[PDB]
Amino acid sequence: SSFSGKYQLQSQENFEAFMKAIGLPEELIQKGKDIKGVSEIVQNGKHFKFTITAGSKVIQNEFTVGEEAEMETMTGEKVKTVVQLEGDNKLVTTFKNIKSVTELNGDIITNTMTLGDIVFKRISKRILE
Amino acid sequence: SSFSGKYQLQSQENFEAFMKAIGLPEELIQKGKDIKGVSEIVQNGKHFKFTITAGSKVIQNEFTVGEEAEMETMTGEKVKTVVQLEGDNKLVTTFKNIKSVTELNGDIITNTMTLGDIVFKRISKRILE
Numbered sequence: 695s696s697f698s699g700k701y702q703l704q705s706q707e708n709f710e711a712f713m714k715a716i717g718l719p720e721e722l723i724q725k726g727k728d729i730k731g732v733s734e735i736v737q738n739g740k741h742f743k744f745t746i747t748a749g750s751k752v753i754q755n756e757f758t759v760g761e762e763a764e765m766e767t768m769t770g771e772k773v774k775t776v777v778q779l780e781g782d783n784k785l786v787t788t789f790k791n792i793k794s795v796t797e798l799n800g801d802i803i804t805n806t807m808t809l810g811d812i813v814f815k816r817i818s819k820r821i822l823e
Numbered sequence: 824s825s826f827s828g829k830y831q832l833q834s835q836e837n838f839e840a841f842m843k844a845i846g847l848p849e850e851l852i853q854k855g856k857d858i859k860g861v862s863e864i865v866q867n868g869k870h871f872k873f874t875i876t877a878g879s880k881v882i883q884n885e886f887t888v889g890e891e892a893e894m895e896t897m898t899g900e901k902v903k904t905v906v907q908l909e910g911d912n913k914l915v916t917t918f919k920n921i922k923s924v925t926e927l928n929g930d931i932i933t934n935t936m937t938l939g940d941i942v943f944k945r946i947s948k949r950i951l952e
């Protein structure tokens with residue numbers, strides 16, 4: 695129903711493989727690969743504010759689903775894309791050659807990003823406040 | 824007694840002036856000044872693990888009070904210093920020309936970093952799980 699919350703990374707798969715494929719330096723990959731931080735989502739209807747802890751970087755993006763928005767990626771590149779809400783619990787977008795699916799089930803968010811044959815998956819749990 | 828917990832930044836003073844003084848790139852100052860992230864402390868006796876969200880960077884440091892430690896600073900430089908316990912609720916250290924005081928008051932942490940005539944203050948609040 696609502697994505698709002700603070701989410702603690704629990705586990706992830708193919709962080710190093712994904713970050714290498716998009717061109718992150720090995721130095722940043724090694725620094726960030728073991729960080730299990732907290733991301734925050736604030737949802738207000740179709741409007742979302744994301745404060746994402748991804749490795750050693752914090753990225754803060756904002757968008758209304760269905761509207762074109764400029765979003766900062768891991769590389770620092772700002773891409774223009776549209777994020778759609780599928781049902782009430784799935785955010786889906788494409789940018790460059792990446793497909794991204796953010797799915798909320800109960801208190802668990804599963805983020806799946808697909809680049810070629812690499813499936814980068816993050817599983818995070820809502821902090822119960 | 825224990826610093827352990829996750830803390831969300833509530834307010835801060837003189838971020839830009841302090842970051843300019845230590846030489847952070849202007850582009851990182853502008854993107855980081857408005858981020859209100861979550862920092863995590865894990866304390867085991869005199870041993871501390873810090874996962875700090877500062878602006879758009881995540882910094883992970885470990886140390887034992889009273890022992891010389893190698894710590895990463897906001898610029899990425901590693902410094903060697905000793906962190907002391909003042910009382911039971913203050914961590915105090917000096918490195919280069921900076922004095923840092925981390926004070927725990929119930930659910931509030933206040934971090935004060937003095938560089939010459941600039942006092943960079945951060946106030947954070949424990950996330951109640």
Ligand SMILES: CCCCCCCCCCCCCCCC(=O)O
Binds near residue numbers: 732753765768816
């Ligand atoms: C699409 C713009 C953001 C690009 C950053 C990609 C790195 C992973 C993003 C996953 C965040 C999705 C929200 C769930 C919480 C989390 O996994 O931190």
Ligand SMILES: CCCCCCCCCCCCCCCC(=O)O
Binds near residue numbers: 876877894
């Ligand atoms: C000693 C240098 C550590 C890294 C420098 C980053 C600058 C901000 C450090 C403040 C962290 C103090 C921990 C309390 C929680 C917080 O304020 O995030």
